[PDB]
């Protein structure tokens, strides 16, 4: 396995939950807004969002 | 038949990339010769005629 500069997890979770910051509960639609934050020195793939 | 939602969460899974490596890749992808591009698998105009 490679070592140096391939992985560090110094107090950073692999999974972050993000709870809504606005919500709407209309009869035919439910809207939810989030603040999706990607910290410094992190890259997020949007193919792992659900 | 009815449906109602209580709580919709967003879960985002970040790779724990090394910090120096992470911000090397930030520099590269904040340039306009490295701008990402996507396409639909079905690239089409969709028209329904009666």
């Amino acid at each position: 396995a490679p070592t140096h500069d391939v992985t560090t997890d110094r107090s950073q979770r692999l999974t972050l939950r993000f709870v809504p910051v606005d919500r709407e509960d209309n009869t035919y639609s439910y809207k939810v807004r989030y603040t999706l934050a990607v910290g410094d020195n992190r890259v997020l793939d949007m193919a792992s969002t659900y | 038949a009815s449906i109602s939602f209580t709580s919709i969460n967003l879960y985002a899974t970040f790779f724990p990339m090394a910090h120096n490596t992470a911000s090397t890749l930030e520099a590269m992808l904040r340039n306009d010769t490295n701008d990402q591009s996507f396409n639909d698998y079905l690239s089409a105009a969709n028209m329904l005629y009666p």
């Binding site: 396995a1 490679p2 070592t3 140096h4 500069d5 391939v6 | 120096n20 490596t21």
Partner: peptide
Amino acid sequence: DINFSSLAPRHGTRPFMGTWSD
């Protein structure tokens, strides 16, 4: 065909790409 414990990159990532200190 391919299977697990054999997915080897060998090579690192960053300090080969020249950097020099302040």
